[PDB]
Structures are given as C-alpha cells and as structure tokens.
C-alpha cells in the first residue's frame, strides 16, 4: 500500500485514535475514530479494507473485552461493524492467508484462549479452526508461504519462548523451534524468508532484542536490537523495512517509531506518533 495505519491503543485508558503515517513525506493524518475505544487489538488489511480485531475497552465505567470486528474504508473514511467473533479476545494476534483473517488466542477475563477462528470477508462470517497447542495471549502472528505462525505470548501462568505453525490444508498446528528469548507482547512480522520477533516482555523487563526465524533452517538468530525497549508495540512491514510503533518501556508509553533496514542491520528513529501509547493495531494500505 502507501500508508501505515495505527488504530486504538492505551494511555491511561483505551483509545479510539485512527492515524495514518506516510513514510514518503513524514506526515501524519488523523482519521475517523473507532466507534468503541480499544487496546490490545490487532490490525490487518484485506482487499484495500482495514480491519480492527478484538482488544479490550479499559474505561472509567468498566472494562469490556472485545469480540468485535470493525472495517474501515479509506475511500469513505468510515468504520462499519462486521460479524463478531465467537468469543472476546484481548491481546489478540492476527494474520491473513488467501484473503481470510485468522484470529489467534487472546483473553476473555481470566480465560486465556488457545482457540482460533477464521473470517471470510466474502461471507462476513467467522468459523473456528483447530486450536493452538498452547493458550497464548500477547501472541505475535505472521504469515509466510501460506503458513501461519504463532510466537510467544502468555498462557495464564508462564510467559513463552515457544512458537507453533498452522498448516491450513491439514488444519493442524505443529511446534517449531522455540525462540532464544521469552517474549510476551512482542511485535511479530515477516520479511523475506524470516519471521521476526521484536521486543516484548520476558517476565522481568521490557526487551529491545530482536530475533528472526529462518523457515528453511528452522533456527532463530538475533539481529541488531531496537533503540528502545518496548512491549505491546505495533509492527508492520513497508517496502522491505520493519516499522515498530509505540509500546511500553517500563517507564513511559512511547511515541517513538523505529525503522529496521535488514541490509544494513540497523534501526533508526523515523518519526514520533502524535502521542505515546501501547497496544495499537497496525496495518498498511492505500491513502484515504
Ligand atoms: N506491557 C504493555 C501493557 O502496558 C499496560 C497497559 C497495556 S494495554 C496493552 C498492553 C499494555
């Protein structure tokens, strides 16, 4: 696409912001608010539409986990409700395969889901698929070569370095090599033939380390760390570079946005969000 969209998030309470950053000229645009504030959601794009999935509304008047799927049309600058998921999913992970949205894990109250469901936009309907081998919230999800990966998270008792892969034509999950680091709330994305896991929380500290999984070799290698420790960051890829947005570093809710160039193996600060926040949903699509 052309713009990096950031939806929702958390600072003092769950947020309704939708803002779009243009890497070509550095500018931010504030767009139509989410109908309901939410943090811990995931974002994704299918057919030029932006989707906001799951999350939780942490508010003065209570706290409600979200089963909502909401669609944003850049041409109209309007959000529309879509079919809700079977269950609320806070700290959700999402990935897209063949035009379908997979919702992975997350929490509802003290329930930590291992369940997974798939949304088909052409039918506006959700269907459950095979559950993961492990309950995971704060799970990172990415897609490579039509396979879905769930990385890290928290199972209700332990934070995880484990990861697993979903094979759609077998409707089956299999464990892959665990990361070298325990990470909850890491940013997970795909670049070239590798799954990247950036930042997160290991139980004691927020992380700046970054490692990547080569699917051919089945090994995790550390790359250069980010300039700022952060968990509950947003992540996306734009023209071959990784962008990480916001997060929580144990002291401050970050407005920092960093950009990773895999050819130089370096991170640089590229912009700041209009305000610090964590738990945003991020995706890339056309200009509104
Ligand atoms: N570790 C990040 C964490 O910070 C406190 C509030 C929220 S909402 C989503 C994630 C988070």
Swiss-Prot record:
Consequence when changing residue 91 to A: Impaired interaction with SQSTM1/p62. Abolished interaction with SQSTM1/p62
Consequence of substituting residue 91 to M: Impaired interaction with NFE2L2/NRF2
Effect of residue 159 to M: Impaired interaction with NFE2L2/NRF2
Superkingdom, taxonomy of origin: Eukaryota
Modification note: Non-enzymatic covalent modifications of reactive cysteines by electrophile metabolites inactivate the BCR(KEAP1) complex. Accumulation of fumarate promotes the formation of cysteine S-succination (S-(2-succinyl)cysteine), leading to inactivate the BCR(KEAP1) complex and promote NFE2L2/NRF2 nuclear accumulation and activation. Nitric oxide-dependent 8-Nitro-cGMP formation promotes cysteine guanylation (S-cGMP-cysteine), leading to NFE2L2/NRF2 nuclear accumulation and activation. Degraded via a proteasomal-independent process during selective autophagy: interaction with phosphorylated SQSTM1/p62 sequesters KEAP1 in inclusion bodies, leading to its degradation.
Coiled-coil features, chain-numbered ranges: none
S-cGMP-cysteine: residues bearing it: 110
Effect of residue 39 to A: Impaired interaction with SQSTM1/p62
Its job: Substrate-specific adapter of a BCR (BTB-CUL3-RBX1) E3 ubiquitin ligase complex that regulates the response to oxidative stress by targeting NFE2L2/NRF2 for ubiquitination. KEAP1 acts as a key sensor of oxidative and electrophilic stress: in normal conditions, the BCR(KEAP1) complex mediates ubiquitination and degradation of NFE2L2/NRF2, a transcription factor regulating expression of many cytoprotective genes.
Subunit organization: Component of the BCR(KEAP1) E3 ubiquitin ligase complex, at least composed of 2 molecules of CUL3, 2 molecules of KEAP1, and RBX1. Interacts with NFE2L2/NRF2; the interaction is direct. Forms a ternary complex with NFE2L2/NRF2 and PGAM5. Interacts with (phosphorylated) SQSTM1/p62; the interaction is direct and inactivates the BCR(KEAP1) complex by sequestering it in inclusion bodies, promoting its degradation. Interacts with NFE2L1. Interacts with BPTF and PTMA. Interacts with MAP1LC3B. Interacts indirectly with ENC1. Interacts with SESN1 and SESN2. Interacts with HSP90AA1 and HSP90AB1.
Comment block on domains: The Kelch repeats mediate interaction with NFE2L2/NRF2, BPTF and PGAM5. KEAP1 contains reactive cysteine residues that act as sensors for endogenously produced and exogenously encountered small molecules, which react with sulfhydryl groups and modify the cysteine sensors, leading to impair ability of the BCR(KEAP1) complex to ubiquitinate target proteins.
Protein's name in the database: Kelch-like ECH-associated protein 1
Record organism: Mus musculus (Mouse)
Gene name of this polypeptide: Keap1
Section covered of the full-length record: 325 to 612 of 624
């Amino acid at each position: 696409g052309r713009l990096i969209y950031t939806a929702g998030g958390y600072f003092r309470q769950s947020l309704s912001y939708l803002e779009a950053y243009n890497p070509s000229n550095g500018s931010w645009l504030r767009l139509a608010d989410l109908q309901v504030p939410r943090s811990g959601l995931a974002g994704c794009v299918v057919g030029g539409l932006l989707y906001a999935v799951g999350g939780r509304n942490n508010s003065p008047d209570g706290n409600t986990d979200s089963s909502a799927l909401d669609c944003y049309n850049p041409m109209t600058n309007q959000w529309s409700p879509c079919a809700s998921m079977s269950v609320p999913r806070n700290r959700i992970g999402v990935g897209v395969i063949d035009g379908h949205i997979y919702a992975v894990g997350g929490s509802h109250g003290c329930i930590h889901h291992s369940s997974v469901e798939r949304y088909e936009p052409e039918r506006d309907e959700w269907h459950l698929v095979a559950p993961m081998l492990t309950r995971r919230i704060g799970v990172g999800v990415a897609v490579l070569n039509r396979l879905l990966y769930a990385v890290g998270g928290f199972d209700g008792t332990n934070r995880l370095n484990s990861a697993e892969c979903y094979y759609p034509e077998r409707n089956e999950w299999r464990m892959i090599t665990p990361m070298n680091t325990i990470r909850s709330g890491a940013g997970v994305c795909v670049l070239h033939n590798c799954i990247y896991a950036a930042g997160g929380y290991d139980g004691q500290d927020q992380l700046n380390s970054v490692e990547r999984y080569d699917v051919e070799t089945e090994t995790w290698t550390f790359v250069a760390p980010m300039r700022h420790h952060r968990s509950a960051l947003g992540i996306t890829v734009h023209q071959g570079k990784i962008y990480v947005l916001g997060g929580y570093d144990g002291h401050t809710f970050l407005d920092s946005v960093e950009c990773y160039d895999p050819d130089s193996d370096t991170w640089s600060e590229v912009t700041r969000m209009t305000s610090g926040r964590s738990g945003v949903g991020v995706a890339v699509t056309m200009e509104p």
